[PDB]
């Protein structure tokens, strides 16, 4: 698997400074790399893709670069609203992997963001991911696990059109992906839950991450 080593877990900066967050792929990943911004209680917002193309709406402050192995995300004049988590994504080959992330800081009320469920150990859970506003069958749906202080993990994806699926070997026996064309809803069923399965589970379309769902196993 391709490991993406992100240069610092924590980065201190100040409003007005220039910042550089880097990711080093352990194998060549071409220019298939994306950078995301994630604020607490929110979901990743795509900033750069194909390593250097700025996504629509993202302010010039952000710039991406690199090809093959060393990727960089630079913010020319850091602003307050920029203080967040940033992580890189590699989509050159399976399993898709992510850099453990970088928290950009200097040195708010949050309620049910996201909502979720508390289930029992050894039990099973089936998470939903309703889609709206676009042709469900035309875009892969990915599922990602996020624990609080660790790096994002990609579970697998599925093409709703024919339900073709890819699994990160690590989740092969824990997750099973399905979709329901009739209600444009993708699902993920986790089996034999342990405290290790407690996390926020996101489903994502290229450029649109869901709000996620908190699965607590107690």
Ligand X SMILES: CC1(C)S[C@@H]2[C@H](NC(=O)[C@H](N)c3ccccc3)C(=O)N2[C@H]1C(=O)O
The residue (of 200 and 204) whose beta carbon lies closer to ligand X is 204
CB of 57 to ligand X, least distance (A): 17
The yes or no reply on residue 10 touching ligand X (CB under 6 A) is no
Query: Cα separation of 88 and 26, whole Å?
Result: 13
The residue (of 34 and 51) whose beta carbon lies closer to ligand X is 34
Strand partners, 103: 10, 85
Residue of 38, 66, 65 lying closest to 54 (CA atoms): 65
The pattern of x and - marking residues 32 through 61 that bind ligand X according to CB under 6 A reads: --x---------------------------
Query: Cα separation of 50 and 31, whole Å?
Result: 5
3-state secondary structure of 6: strand
The yes or no reply on residue 157 touching ligand X (CB under 6 A) is yes
Query: Cα separation of 76 and 62, whole Å?
Result: 7
The residue (of 63 and 91) whose beta carbon lies closer to ligand X is 91
The yes or no reply on residue 96 touching ligand X (CB under 6 A) is yes
Angle at 32 between CA 78 and CA 156, to 5 degrees: 105
- Which segment (22-30, 77-85, 118-126, 136-144) binds ligand X by CB under 6 A? 136-144
The yes or no reply on residue 170 touching ligand X (CB under 6 A) is no
Answer for the pair 190, 127: CB distance below 8 angstroms, yes or no: yes
The footprint of ligand X (CB under 6 A) covers 34, 91, 96, 140, 142, 144, 154, 157, 204-206
């Amino acid at each position: 698997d391709i490991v993406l080593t992100q240069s610092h877990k924590f980065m201190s900066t100040s409003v007005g400074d220039r910042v550089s967050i880097t990711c080093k792929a352990s194998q060549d990943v071409g220019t298939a790399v994306a950078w995301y911004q994630q604020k607490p209680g929110q979901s990743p917002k795509l900033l750069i893709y194909w390593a250097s193309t700025r996504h629509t709406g993202v302010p010039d402050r952000f710039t991406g670069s690199g090809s093959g192995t060393d990727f960089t995300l630079t913010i020319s004049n850091v602003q307050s609203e920029d203080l967040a988590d940033y992580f890189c994504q590699q989509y050159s080959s399976y399993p898709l992997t992510f850099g453990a992330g970088t928290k950009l800081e200097l040195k708010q009320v949050q309620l049910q963001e996201p909502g979720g469920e508390l289930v029992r150990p050894g039990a099973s859970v089936k998470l939903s991911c309703k889609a709206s506003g676009y042709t469900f069958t035309s875009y892969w749906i990915n599922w990602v696990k996020q624990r609080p202080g660790q790096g994002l993990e990609w579970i697998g994806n599925i093409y709703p059109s024919d339900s073709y699926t890819n699994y990160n070997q690590k989740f092969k026996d824990k997750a099973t992906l399905t979709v329901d064309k009739s209600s444009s809803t993708a699902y993920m069923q986790l089996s034999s839950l342990t405290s290790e399965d407690s996390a926020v589970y996101f489903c994502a379309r290229w450029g649109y991450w869901g709000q996620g769902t908190l699965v607590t196993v107690s």
